[PDB]
Paper text:
Phytochromes are biliprotein photoreceptors widespread amongst microorganisms and ubiquitous in plants where they control developmental processes as diverse as germination, stem elongation and floral induction through the photoconversion of inactive Pr to the Pfr signalling state. The principal role of phyA is to detect exceedingly low light levels by integrating photons over prolonged periods, whereby molecules in the inactive Pr state are converted to and accumulate as the Pfr signalling state in the nucleus (the very low fluence response or VLFR). Here we report crystal structures of the chromophore-binding module of soybean phytochrome A, including ~2.2 Å XFEL structures of Pr and Pfr at ambient temperature and high resolution cryogenic structures of Pr. Here we present several novel 3D structures of a minimal soybean phyA(nPAS-GAF) construct as Pr and Pfr.
Numbering used by the authors:
A (entry chain A): 67 to 110, 120 to 345, 360 to 407
B (entry chain B): 67 to 109, 120 to 345, 360 to 406
The structure:
């Protein structure tokens, strides 16, 4: 069963669009790093390895903000942090989460001349999502079809992907594409049913906790995460924004002409279950910044509430 | 409206919490500045008329403001986080346009706020979006319950001592129809006020400037100087920093509302100013632009629900 989960947490591979550090929960020093992190974060005991102090990597407001995060509980972390590398000023969004023993930081590059617009762009992303949420709210109740069609249209406009689908899980765990919008000319997948095994339990289980997942390029060469072999626990990457897709799925995307994807879990009663996914595909590589993904998380949460109301209301009328 | 509009539209006095520049769209050079701008933005001659912003700000900052000249008002995404070239001091630059001028308000940012710039913007908008979902799920039918919820939500989001819903009657006089305060404050719930307490000129400006903040009614106002070559006065009333008229400043001091934040409630935005959400604080208070921006959208949603409650009511 869960030889799948072993590889999906302890696989130690990330997507190369960003890099990863894990810091010790007490010393704040590097205990693990992706192999691309030296070249991404430094110009260059190298400049970056096990035991590196982050005060040597980043400017003082940047390192200061990460040191302070080492003091904050998980739910109290406000992401992302805007960080600059020492000397170069090279900027990244740092997205922080905690595992037992460690603070994990995903670093996603930002275009330097866009740094002045970071707050502006984050507000605009959430504003657009918030407007989408008001349009979901004003929909007349009583039609799951209208709700799902509206949601895929909103996600399509917000995210700019080639294809957006609502993928519903049936009682037997097989899935169905129940709503879809594409750029003109693409073949539809609307209506198609797919076996339970296309989306393994481990992936469904992960979606309960990791609610938005982005794959930038299914063909990109994955990068290993190295950790001190004496670290008294294994570092899991299930929470990382950068976690590489399992090679099977990477192959699956290749076969389907989805080079890129963005997937939002739809969890009702967040008893709790995965109702389905909002699945975005792109024909070419696609990156969208963490603020938009964050705004999409809330949109998906509101959608799930409305989904569950439509279920209740058609459970009642019958 | 005769006299008031002249002075308010020119907006030659600002609050000292921030500073203002106006740039000529054609040249990108300074054509107006608040008298505190030299001290705030500098430590190449003095900042004055004719100054090139490439001498005031770091290169990415100056480029971001120069790029803003090529956006229609409606397409400006605010704020811009700028750093001063000499000091490295950070500010939020809030940009608006008046014809061929670009007007920039600069509000200081604390050094530890800079790395959390996007994080704090998302959190402010997330809190406001959650407030919006609670407004939406309110059962229809009660203007009172709607306004009560709104003042509660604004109170929690903004941290002011007092939040009121202030409704304009057909004769333009006002009534406080909902209120929440910290314990011990004197209530104004239910009180009616004359139309003249909020002049037409003020009500007209709220149609366009939807959120207005006063940090400290006692603070000494700062003059804006403009290019002597201009044969007319610039309009600076779009500024976030515009100083309150001294009559209003006195009224606040009288009332022991030292600070305020006021949101316009415009229905059919039939288009009219239904009222105001009025926040007061006993002591000075500043809230940063991203939160005020998020408040603007909360107020817009509120206005939609107010007009629904009006229509549900005219149906009975
Ligand atoms: C390999 C032997 C098997 C397998 C494994 C597998 N699949 C996933 C994850 C996903 N598979 C998805 C399938 C679909 N996506 C679509 O667009 C459609 C239909 C139009 C289907 C049916 C989706 C979605 C996911 C989620 C991926 C994501 O974005 O996170 C995984 C986990 C991948 C990971 O590492 O997270 C694995 C191991 N898939 C197969 O087809 C075979 C049977
Ligand atoms: C001066 C002779 C007259 C006058 C002028 C005046 N008033 C305003 C603006 C406002 N007055 C407000 C009044 C209230 N605030 C409250 O909390 C209550 C009741 C509880 C009332 C009635 C409010 C609000 C405003 C808006 C101010 C804001 O925050 O923008 C103005 C415009 C000031 C400006 O510079 O924008 C002027 C010129 N007020 C008087 O009382 C007398 C008659």
């Amino acid at each position: 069963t869960t030889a799948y989960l072993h590889h999906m947490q302890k696989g130690k591979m990330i997507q190369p669009f960003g890099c990863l550090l894990a810091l010790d929960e007490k010393t704040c020093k590097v205990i693990a790093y992706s192999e691309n992190a030296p070249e991404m974060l430094t110009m260059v005991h190298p400049a970056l390895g096990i035991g590196t102090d982050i005060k040597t990597l980043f400017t003082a407001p940047s390192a200061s903000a990460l040191q302070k995060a080492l003091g904050f509980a998980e739910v109290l972390l406000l992401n992302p942090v805007l960080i600059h590398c020492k000397t170069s000023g090279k900027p990244f969004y740092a997205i922080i989460h905690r595992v037992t023993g460690s603070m994990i930081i995903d670093f996603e590059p930002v275009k330097p001349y866009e740094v002045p617009m970071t707050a502006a762009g984050a507000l605009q992303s959430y504003k657009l999502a918030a407007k989408a949420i008001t349009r979901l709210q004003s929909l007349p109740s009583g039609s799951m079809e209208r709700l799902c069609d509206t949601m895929v249209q909103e996600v399509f406009e917000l995210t700019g992907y080639d294809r957006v689908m609502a993928y519903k899980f049936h009682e037997d765990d097989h899935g169905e594409v129940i709503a879809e919008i594409t750029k003109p000319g693409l073949e539809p997948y609307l209506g198609l049913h797919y076996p339970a095994t296309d989306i393994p339990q481990a992936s469904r289980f992960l979606f309960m906790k990791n609610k938005v997942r982005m794959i930038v390029d299914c063909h990109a060469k994955h990068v290993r995460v190295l950790q001190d072999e004496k670290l008294p626990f294994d570092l899991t990457l299930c929470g990382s924004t950068l976690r590489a897709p399992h090679s099977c799925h990477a192959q699956y995307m290749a076969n389907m002409d989805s080079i890129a994807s963005l997937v939002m879990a739809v969890v009702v009663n967040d008893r709790k279950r995965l109702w389905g996914l909002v699945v975005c595909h792109n024909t070419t590589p696609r990156f969208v910044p963490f603020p938009l993904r964050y705004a999409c998380e809330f949109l998906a949460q509101v959608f799930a509430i409305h989904v569950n109301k439509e279920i209740e209301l058609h459970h009642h009328h019958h």
